[PDB]
Design a protein around this nucleic acid. Structure first.
Length: 1240
RNA sequence: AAUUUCUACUCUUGUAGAUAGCAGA
DNA sequence: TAGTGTTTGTCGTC
DNA sequence: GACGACAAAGCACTA
């Protein structure tokens, strides 16, 4: 097995896109015939027909729901039993019962069953079949069910073109399917409305039994309105009536028995919805509801469990406090011997149940009520102060955009507040409160959608990428390149002087007309035309044209002699009866031999069948020319799989023949041919440099090597698109103006966005104002250029453009899908223990950081990827963008940041693949399922980086390096295939081919010399008793006079209540308060050893500002003040406890806080070092400021190193494992135990 | 500030990387 | 009594 | 029992 052998394993399909430039006067001919305008109208017709078909989509659904008659007694009993006993058996019984009822409704739409009489059951299938076919426009489906003339004229607009609704058919299948999917009609009937209707019947009978006078009163309300005249009030609250509550008109009548593109568009619509909130007085109603909570019974006001953690973080210290406070109070009221099983039951109960507001107050204290009152009035005042604040006149200025966002934040804040309360009727909700809350709520739901629509408008770009597909009045345009379908499709390609041209033949005067392109000698100058020959598949096309056609099937049925085929045959073929009988556990198939076992009959029949196929190919009118003599005789063919896989590549072929330029130019001159040059900036006159990957795929497809031996196949079903211009604001660099580079003299540090505009205006002498102080300072550093030629901003969308989306297939000689790809990778890895690793982590001072390690674990190379292609993406560019978002906090700045991150990550995968191929390594990412990263990290968690991993998997599916020759492995003809096909984020686990995913947590805050981690969670120390109990668990803390350090011995079998439950290896540790000394690094720079950056400034705000702190110096100073003598080397902790100085104990613990903190960062001073608190086996505490290459350089370096180290643990278990499998993730304790043992 | 277009850019009338489209969210 | 402008074929997995 | 990929086979229109 070789690493270069990971190619040609499965087919990968990519569709290239190009721009079509009209040649000669083909644009004039198109405009004269009005093809673009007609196709533009077809786009509008397709969109205007979107609800018309959806309307004729209800008719059928409404008609099918009118005949539904079911007995809902069984469904009610399954609902009652699940509410009665909360066991998993009654849940699965209800899930199956619901699925049975959903299918009962589905059988009315398309039953294909025996429950409904076929007279009716089969009639629905004839409609549902062509509900996703042409029938829609035939009027046939409407003939089964009245169309108006304009609607009839709209249906015929898609005659011979109903494939335009291809994707729309899928969107309508997503509406039915009769699954638990909420989008479906059966689900809405069974699982949404019936539990509501079933509850209505129970509410009815309880009221009528207690207050019988309410019966005649309800009956009078029904009679006074006029609804359900043939049904009494008791029957509408009985199960049989629900069958007549399945259509909207009946649902509306039932509910009424109960109830009785532009800038100013966002201002007019919002102000219309905004002024509607005053008339409804939703603020006054909301302010009155939250004021009711001061006196009403709070044991029936429930908080949703999905919001409890969010509320805890908004009203308390952490997200933990509420869930923990409820946990302690519930453990406080358990019965008998409180086992650890009873505690876990209380934990699991708090995850998925709604807590009433009273139990929260009784468990958290009176300080939550003050937080609840203050937060409620704060949100209500902001929403009240925003409804009366008028919107601006326009959105031209950013100051006017800010007030629009500010008022939307207040509206979304109130909308967020209302979603705190549980909506489900499973809880005993208050009568009046739940009704008034659900009312103002139903009203605030479009705010969220409206808010999202508004934010996207600000994020939107001034372009209009919207486009429509050009058909040229052909439903099969560019649907196939075969020469025999020249007229049928009318799309061919030309190559001339390295420039690729597309030629489409229009219907000449409304009729098909072939062009007699005469093959001219190659010497004469002219275009080269593609001759495309293709036989789709031997398995499906051969029987269709030879033994399964209408002629021979009927002939063999009514006549028992072989028949001769003459049409589409050079020499007549004598198809005989037996081979058709074989094709009538099919015969000559693997199943037949597996079951029957007639091996002798198999080999003879297959020999005749294979010979018959070989007989067919040499006799067919188009397959006779291809040289099939390379095929082996039928005696040594095992089965059809190997034979068809061998026969298929021989059929497909592309050849080029020169066509004289005079014919092509005259064809364009008269208008018979439309010439479109393919253009992707790699065919420009001034082009110089390595081209795009898509250009190489296009260039490599037509290379002489590929034509002789196919590895890139030109797939059919190509598409043409036309994009209208979007010239609304043209910016240009006119001649005589002075360009300004976005980078300084070093062409690596970008100018801030705000400063760049001011400098650019001053350079051109256009700014009326004066430059800032920092603008003057940065002025000499910028570089200016004169405009030699005009550069048009966004020139792509200035004018109208054509497009050509063409699909190609790479690795055409491989299988359709990979077959156990991970087994192949694991096989290579097992035989190659020396395969290096590549660990990638998201640092804070570095966007993406890399570290490669070998089998033994030494760091071969570690690099920071924030500087790609001589440009700084983090140290300068992302910092300025983050500065702007912290200054303005607008929507445009957020959109630019997300686009930059995705663009930066595109550059990263090139660095990864270039690094990986050079080392022949395996790259280990981190799975997003486990853990999270802080806000200080440069990439948002599970939002952009999750898509980053998708790109890396997809890129390595068909990895092609653009500096490589095509013939060797890794080129365009033989791409690398190192990853399995991506299916979903959930399905990918710990391996995706040559990619590994190890748990993120417990990777970057570890000493790389001892494997030590901070074993104490500091949230368990709050009071003096906790501090003293924590401090008394240690063994001994003493001054070493020889070295000047403090050795704080600790045994992991102590302070369990303050620990994190991960002992790991090394049951004892020696925390060292390193003596501060001006140590020198490799470069000789001075740095003080043991320096720690502590952010603790206030009890509530623990990261107000970073503060310098020296654990050794401060603790010596603290002990001197207390009068403690410690130079004798005696233990210090017992003497600390006996004096019982509250301030000294707090300082004692706070210093242990600092020393156990390894990752010390300071953005202002540029320090991101990591310092070990414990000594290694050599006896030296790790300090990353030493800049030793063999160990991580900075804090971000440590994380990428251990992700690669976590990759070793996966492979180390892989090598020793007998099976070719991997563990379903790495336990945090198991990883800690492994690393702590290895570093020793 | 020039792109099948996405990001960044301007020694180079263009550079470096990415780029599986259509339809529907 | 024909030019010409939707149907069918499956092999393996799934 | 359920998916496909592009051709050549059919199949209805007027003639």
């Amino acid at each position: 097995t070789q690493f270069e052998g990971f190619t040609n394993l499965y087919q990968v399909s990519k569709t290239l896109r190009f721009e079509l430039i009209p040649q000669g006067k083909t644009l004039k001919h198109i405009q004269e015939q009005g093809f673009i305008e007609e196709d533009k109208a077809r786009n509008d017709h397709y969109k205007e027909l979107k609800p018309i078909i959806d309307r004729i989509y209800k008719t059928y659904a409404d008609q099918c729901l009118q005949l539904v008659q079911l007995d809902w007694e069984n469904l009610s009993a399954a609902i009652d039993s699940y509410r009665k006993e909360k066991t998993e058996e009654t849940r699965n019984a209800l899930i199956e019962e619901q699925a049975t009822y959903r299918n009962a409704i589905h059988d009315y739409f398309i039953g294909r069953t025996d429950n409904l009489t076929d007279a009716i059951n089969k009639r629905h299938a004839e409609i549902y079949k062509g509900l996703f076919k042409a029938e829609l426009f035939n009027g046939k489906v409407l003939k089964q069910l009245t169309t108006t003339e304009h609607e009839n004229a709209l249906l015929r607009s898609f005659d011979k073109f109903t494939t335009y609704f291809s994707g729309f058919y899928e969107n309508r299948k997503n509406v039915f399917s009769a699954e638990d999917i909420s989008t479906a009609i059966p689900h809405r009937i069974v699982q949404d409305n019936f539990p509501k209707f079933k509850e209505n019947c129970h509410i009815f009978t309880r009221l009528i039994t207690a207050v019988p006078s309410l019966r005649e009163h309800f009956e009078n309300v029904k009679k006074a309105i006029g609804i359900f005249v043939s049904t009494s009030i008791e029957e509408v609250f009985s199960f049989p009536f629900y069958n007549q509550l399945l259509t909207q008109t009946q649902i509306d009548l039932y509910n009424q028995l109960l109830g009785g593109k532009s800038d100013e568009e966002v201002i007019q619509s919002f102000c219309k919805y905004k002024t509607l909130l005053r008339n409804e007085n939703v603020l006054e109603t909301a302010e009155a509801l939250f004021n009711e909570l001061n006196s009403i019974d709070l044991t029936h006001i429930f908080i949703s469990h999905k919001k409890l953690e969010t509320i805890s973080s908004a009203l308390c210290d952490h997200w933990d406090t509420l869930r923990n406070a409820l946990y302690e109070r519930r453990i406080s009221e358990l019965t008998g011997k409180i086992t650890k099983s009873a505690k876990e039951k209380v934990q699991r109960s708090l995850k998925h149940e709604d807590i009433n507001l009273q139990e929260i107050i009784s468990a958290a204290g009176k300080e939550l009520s003050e937080a609840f009152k203050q937060k409620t009035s704060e949100i209500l005042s902001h929403a009240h102060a925003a409804l009366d604040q008028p919107l601006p006149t326009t959105l031209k200025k950013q100051e006017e955009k800010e007030i629009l966002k500010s008022q939307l934040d207040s509206l979304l804040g109130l909308y967020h507040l209302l979603d705190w309360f549980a909506v489900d009727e499973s809880n005993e909700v208050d009568p009046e409160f739940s009704a008034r809350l659900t009312g103002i709520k139903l009203e605030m739901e479009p705010s969220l959608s409206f808010y999202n629509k508004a934010r996207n408008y600000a994020t939107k770009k001034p372009y209009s990428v919207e486009k429509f597909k050009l058909n040229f009045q052909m439903p099969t345009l560019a649907s196939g390149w075969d020469v025999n379908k020249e007229k049928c499709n009318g799309a061919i390609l030309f190559v001339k002087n390295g420039l690729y041209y597309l030629g489409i033949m229009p219907k000449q005067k409304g009729r098909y007309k072939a062009l007699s392109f005469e093959p001219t000698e190659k010497t004469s100058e002219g275009f080269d035309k593609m001759y495309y020959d293709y036989f789709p598949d031997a398995a499906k096309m051969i029987p269709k044209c030879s033994t399964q056609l209408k002629a021979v099937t009927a002939h063999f049925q009514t006549h028992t002699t072989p028949i001769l085929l003459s049409n589409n045959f050079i020499e007549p073929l004598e198809i005989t009866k037996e081979i058709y009988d074989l094709n009538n556990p099919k015969k000559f198939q693997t199943a037949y031999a597996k079951k029957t076992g007639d091996q002798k009959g198999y080999r003879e029949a297959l020999c005749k069948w294979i010979d018959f196929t070989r007989d067919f190919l040499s006799k067919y009118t188009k397959t006779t020319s291809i040289d099939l003599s390379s095929l082996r005789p039928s005696s040594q063919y095992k089965d059809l799989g190997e034979y068809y896989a061998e026969l298929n590549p021989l059929l497909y072929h592309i050849s080029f023949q020169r066509i004289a330029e005079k014919e092509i130019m005259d064809a364009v001159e008269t208008g018979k041919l439309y010439l479109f040059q393919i253009y992707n900036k790699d065919f420009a006159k001034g082009h110089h440099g390595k081209p795009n990957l898509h250009t190489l795929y296009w260039t490599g497809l037509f290379s002489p090597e590929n034509l002789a031996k196919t590895s890139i196949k030109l797939n059919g079903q190509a598409e043409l698109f036309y994009r209208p211009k979007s010239r609304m604001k043209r910016m240009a660099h006119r001649l005589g103006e002075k360009m300004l580079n976005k980078k300084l003299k070093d062409q690596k540090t970008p100018i801030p966005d705000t400063l760049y505009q001011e400098l650019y205006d001053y350079v051109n002498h256009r700014l009326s104002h004066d430059l800032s102080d920092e603008a003057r300072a940065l002025l000499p550093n910028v570089i200016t250029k004169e405009v030699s030629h005009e550069i048009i901003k966004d020139r792509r969308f200035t004018s109208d453009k054509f497009f050509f989306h063409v699909p190609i297939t790479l690795n055409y000689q491989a299988a359709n899908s990979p077959s156990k790809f991970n087994q192949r990778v694991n096989a290579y890895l097992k035989e190659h223990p020396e395969t290096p690793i590549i660990g990638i982590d998201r640092g804070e001072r570095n966007l993406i950081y890399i570290t490669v390690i070998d089998s033994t674990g030494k760091i071969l190379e570690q690099r920071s990827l924030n500087t790609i292609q001589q440009f700084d993406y983090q140290k300068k560019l992302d910092n300025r963008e983050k500065e702007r978002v912290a200054a303005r906090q607008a929507w445009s700045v957020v959109g630019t940041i997300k686009d930059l991150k995705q663009g930066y990550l595109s550059q990263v995968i090139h660095e990864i693949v270039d690094l990986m191929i050079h080392y022949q390594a395996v790259v280990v990412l981190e799975n997003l399922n486990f853990g999270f990263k802080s806000k200080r990290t440069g990439i948002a968690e599970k939002a952009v980086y999750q898509q980053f991993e998708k790109m890396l998997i997809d890129k390595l599916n068909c990895l092609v390096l653009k500096d490589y020759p095509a013939e060797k492995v890794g080129g365009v003809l033989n791409p690398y295939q190192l990853t399995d096909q991506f299916t979903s984020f959930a399905k990918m686990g710990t391996q995706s081919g040559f990619l590994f995913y190890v748990p993120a947590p417990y990777t970057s805050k570890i000493d790389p010399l001892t494997g030590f981690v901070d074993p104490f969670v500091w949230k368990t120390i709050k009071n003096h008793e906790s501090r003293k109990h924590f401090l008394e668990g240690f063994d001994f803390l003493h001054y070493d006079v020889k070295t000047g350090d403090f050795i704080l011995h600790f045994k992991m079998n102590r302070n369990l209540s303050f620990q994190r439950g991960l002992p790991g290896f090394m049951p004892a540790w020696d925390i060292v308060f390193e003596k501060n000394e001006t140590q020198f690094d490799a470069k000789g720079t001075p740095f003080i050893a043991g320096k720690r950056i502590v952010p603790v400034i206030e009890n509530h705000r623990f990261t107000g500002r970073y503060r310098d702190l020296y654990p050794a110096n401060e603790l010596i100073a603290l002990l001197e003040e207390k009068g403690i003598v410690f130079r004798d080397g005696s233990n210090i902790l017992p003497k600390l406890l006996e004096n019982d100085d509250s301030h000294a104990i707090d300082t004692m613990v706070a210093l242990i806080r600092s020393v156990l903190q390894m990752r010390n960062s300071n953005a202002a001073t540029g320090e991101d070092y990591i310092n070990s608190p414990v000594r290694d086996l050599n006896g030296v505490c790790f300090d990353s400021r030493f800049q030793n290459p063999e160990w991580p350089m900075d804090a971000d370096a440590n994380g990428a190193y251990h992700i690669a180290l976590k990759g070793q643990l996966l492979l180390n278990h892989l090598k020793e494992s007998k099976d070719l499998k991997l563990q379903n993730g790495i336990s945090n304790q198991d990883w800690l135990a492994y690393i702590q043992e290895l570093r020793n």
